[PDB]
């Protein structure tokens, strides 16, 4: 009789889409998959389900919970983490999602599924599932490297034994030597201790040991030392089942067919990225000065006069939606400028494209270390300040940007980075195919859920 797994992502585009992909991976092994969402977020899933269904692909069920926006003083329209801009709104959003516990517990009591896969941001989901002897898995949607780095920083606080903003400290027990500065950490953790953010991270990392285990959107062969470190040194039970976006598997593409292999730079910072006019201006000048052909995705005081005319042969600006995967996988694309969010980083890896890394917040400075120092498939733009706000002082200048654009295309080790990225691409596809490490760990997890008593 059919195994039932319930998936409960936080309402953030970057968590919802990989959660859907995991639900789809489970559905393809004949597991009943239900995703919990809210009314204003349902369209994201309904569209994406049908736009990957009608091929005999199994059915993903949606369950809708009421988000108590009014109750916590959020606008009725604010059912997504992206809409909660400002310190006030974010704190209210987290109180809001915390009040979904009553609905989760009623749903589990009613449906009695075999497993709950709950977002990292719901540490309390473990106790909710335990009430009905249901195992809970934690899903973060980041790298093993980041999960390990964050935890060694939290436990060993290497940044308390420094005396300046830019003083380098090593990550303590790691099998690679990784240096960071305080600038690269959120200001709550290092400068003015704020129990809210600090208590939230503590409960998230503790959930990894208190729960049945951790599903990870990565492949063993990508970061073997950290897949092991997470399980051995840090004691987590984990399954690596990614890259989960490989599960199922236009004018700009015609434009690219005309171009030399590895000749074009793709720049796309995602939907999370909040780009100010002065920053866009420095990118525009750097692109022109670099001489490099480019496809630049933007979400006009911020364009140099005559930009659009000067770059007619060489540069394409797309306002809004780009077919990102089809662009990255085009032979003409030789590099990817990214914020180093894990979804973007994994798409660069899967396309075999070297990356210019532009970390901003969250786990991105850890992802940047993986890409540049361990995988050696990237070049840093030189952003070293962790910030969820964009101060004019933190804008990266034309000269830093131009240096990185040139290095990733024609720098001495640019070809070596391309060769290394092409190897990871082959290893990624091999992980997800029958017999691969990710296919295998998914089989092992399901078998283990089937036998749980």
Q: Which residues bind its own copies (CB under 8 A)?
A: 127, 130-131, 133, 155, 209-210, 232, 234-235
Distance between CA atoms of 111 and 131, rounded to whole angstroms?
Answer: 13
Residue 25 and residue 244 in contact, taking contact as beta carbons nearer than 8 Å: yes
The interface mask with Br ion, positions 277-316, x = CB under 5 A, is ----------------------------------------
Minimum CB separation of residue 170 from Br ion in Å reads 14
Helices 437-450 and 13-27, axial angle in degrees (round to 10): 70
Minimum CB separation of residue 247 from Br ion in Å reads 24
Q: Which does 131 bind (CB under 5 to 8 A by kind): its own copies, Br ion, none?
A: its own copies
Does 347 help bind Br ion (rule: CB under 5 A)?
A: no
Is the Cβ of residue 210 or residue 310 nearer to its own copies in the bound state?
A: 210
Task: Show the 3-state SS of 328-355.
Answer: HCCCCEEEEEECCCHHHHHHHHHHCCCE
Q: Which does 114 bind (CB under 5 to 8 A by kind): Br ion, its own copies, none?
A: none
Residue 41 phi/psi, 5° resolution? -105, -15
Distance between CA atoms of 190 and 379, rounded to whole angstroms?
Answer: 26
**DSSP helix/strand/coil, 51:** coil
Does 21 help bind Br ion (rule: CB under 5 A)?
A: no
| Bridge pairing between strands 136-139 and 169-170 | unpaired
Distance between CA atoms of 312 and 43, rounded to whole angstroms?
Answer: 37
Which residues have a Cβ under 8 Å from the Cβ of 335 and sit 6 or more positions away? 265, 266, 353, 354, 355, 356, 405, 408, 409
Does 402 help bind Br ion (rule: CB under 5 A)?
A: no
Is the Cβ of residue 131 or residue 160 nearer to its own copies in the bound state?
A: 131
Place of tokens 């604010």: 78
Is the Cβ of residue 229 or residue 336 nearer to its own copies in the bound state?
A: 229
Does 359 help bind Br ion (rule: CB under 5 A)?
A: no
E-state strands within 174-323:
179-180, 213-216, 238-240, 264-267, 293-298, 315-319
E-state strands within 154-305:
169-170, 179-180, 213-216, 238-240, 264-267, 293-298
Minimum CB separation of residue 204 from Br ion in Å reads 23
Which of 113, 123, 380, 436 is close enough to bind Br ion by CB under 5 A?
A: 380
Is the Cβ of residue 213 or residue 380 nearer to Br ion in the bound state?
A: 380
Indicate which residue of 4, 15, 140, 339 is catalytic. Answer: 15
Does 225 help bind Br ion (rule: CB under 5 A)?
A: yes
Indicate which residue of 4, 21, 119, 330 is catalytic. Answer: 119
Structure-block tokens of residue 326: 């089809």
Minimum CB separation of residue 210 from its own copies in Å reads 6
Residue 218: exposure state from Cβ atoms within 10 A (0-12, 13-18, ≥19) = buried
Does 372 help bind Br ion (rule: CB under 5 A)?
A: yes
Catalytic: 61?
no
Is the Cβ of residue 53 or residue 403 nearer to Br ion in the bound state?
A: 403
The interface mask with Br ion, positions 48-87, x = CB under 5 A, is ----------------------------------------
Catalytic: 15?
yes
Q: How many CB atoms lie within 10 A of CB 348?
A: 28
Is the Cβ of residue 136 or residue 339 nearer to its own copies in the bound state?
A: 136
Is the Cβ of residue 231 or residue 388 nearer to its own copies in the bound state?
A: 231
Of 6, 255, 13, nearest to 109 by C-alpha is: 6
Which residues have a Cβ under 8 Å from the Cβ of 185 and sit 6 or more positions away? 153, 159, 365, 386
Minimum CB separation of residue 230 from its own copies in Å reads 13
Minimum CB separation of residue 103 from its own copies in Å reads 17
Structure-block tokens of residue 62: 């949606």
Minimum CB separation of residue 131 from its own copies in Å reads 6
Q: Which does 372 bind (CB under 5 to 8 A by kind): its own copies, Br ion, none?
A: Br ion
Provide the annotated active-site residues. Answer: 15, 119
Binding site for Br ion (CB under 5 A): 223, 225, 372, 380
């Amino acid at each position: 009789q059919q195994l039932h797994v319930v998936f409960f992502p936080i309402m953030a585009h970057g968590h919802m889409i990989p959660t859907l992909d995991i639900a789809r991976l489970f559905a393809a092994r004949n597991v009943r998959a239900t995703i919990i969402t809210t009314p204003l977020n349902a369209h994201t899933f309904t569209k994406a389900i049908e736009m990957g269904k009608k091929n005999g692909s199994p059915t993903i069920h949606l369950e809708l919970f009421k988000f108590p926006a009014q109750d916590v003083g959020l606008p009725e329209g604010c059912e997504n983490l992206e809409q909660a801009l400002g310190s006030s709104l974010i704190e209210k959003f987290f109180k809001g999602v915390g009040l979904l516990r009553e609905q989760l517990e009623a749903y589990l009591e009613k449906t009695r599924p075999n497993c709950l896969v709950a977002d990292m941001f719901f540490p309390w989901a473990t106790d909710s599932a335990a009430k009905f002897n249901i195992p809970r898995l934690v899903f973060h949607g980041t790298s093993f490297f980041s999960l390990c780095a964050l935890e060694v920083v939290r436990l060993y606080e290497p940044h308390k034994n420094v005396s300046s903003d830019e003083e380098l400290f090593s990550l303590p027990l790691f099998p690679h030597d990784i240096k960071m500065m305080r600038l690269q950490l959120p200001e709550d953790v290092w400068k003015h201790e704020k129990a809210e953010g600090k208590t939230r991270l503590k409960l998230i990392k503790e959930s990894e040991l208190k729960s049945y285990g951790v599903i990870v959107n990565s492949f063993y062969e990508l970061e073997p030392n950290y897949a092991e470190f997470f399980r051995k040194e840090l004691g987590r039970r984990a399954w690596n089942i990614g890259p989960v976006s490989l599960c199922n598997r236009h004018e700009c593409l015609k434009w690219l067919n005309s171009k030399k292999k590895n000749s074009v730079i793709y720049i796309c910072f995602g939907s999370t990225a909040h780009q100010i006019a002065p920053q866009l201006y420095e990118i525009a000048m750097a692109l022109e000065a670099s001489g490099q052909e480019f496809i630049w995705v933007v979400r006009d005081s911020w364009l140099p006069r005559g930009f659009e005319q000067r770059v007619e042969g060489k540069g394409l600006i797309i306002r809004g939606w780009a077919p990102q995967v089809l662009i990255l996988e085009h032979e003409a694309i030789g590099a990817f400028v990214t914020h180093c969010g894990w979804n973007s980083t994994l798409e660069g890896i899967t396309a075999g494209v070297p990356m210019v890394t532009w970390p901003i917040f969250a786990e991105q400075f850890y992802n940047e270390k993986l890409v540049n120092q361990i995988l050696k498939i990237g070049v840093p733009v030189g952003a070293n300040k962790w910030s969820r706000e964009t101060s004019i002082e933190d804008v990266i200048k034309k000269d830093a940007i131009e240096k990185a654009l040139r290095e990733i295309m024609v720098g001495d080790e640019a070809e070596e980075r391309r060769s290394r990225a092409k190897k990871l691409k082959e290893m990624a596809w091999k992980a997800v195919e029958e017999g691969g490490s990710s296919y295998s760990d998914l089989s092992a997890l399901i078998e283990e859920l089937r036998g749980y008593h």
